[PDB]
Curated annotation (Swiss-Prot):
Keyword flag Ligase: no
Induction details: By interleukin-2.
Protein name: Antimicrobial peptide NK-lysin
Parent-protein residues present: 47 to 124 of 129
Gene name per UniProt: NKL
Localization: Secreted
A Gene Ontology term for the protein's cellular component: extracellular region
GO biological process: antimicrobial humoral immune response mediated by antimicrobial peptide; defense response to bacterium; defense response to fungus; killing of cells of another organism; lipid metabolic process
Length: 78
């Protein structure tokens, strides 16, 4: 709840930043900083990344879409 918007916005800015076919480090840095950079929603993102870091790496590495990521790791409204 709310989170689906938040998570979609968070992931999409990450996806856009890291670009195509990224790797485990670049996703880790680009995401821990996707959040840092995304002002207002900074705390929400940094908490998601702390709680699900290597998952958000798999998610991006598999180029999986935001709606499906947020449903999968259970953040949206399945």
């Amino acid at each position: 709840g709310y989170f689906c918007e938040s998570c979609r916005k968070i992931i999409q800015k990450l996806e856009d930043m890291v670009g195509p076919q990224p790797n485990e480090d670049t996703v880790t840095q680009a995401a821990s900083q996707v959040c840092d950079k995304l002002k207002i929603l900074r705390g929400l993102c940094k908490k998601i990344m702390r709680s699900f870091l290597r998952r958000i790496s798999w998610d991006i590495l598999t180029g999986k879409k935001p709606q499906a990521i947020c449903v999968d790791i259970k953040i949206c409204k399945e």
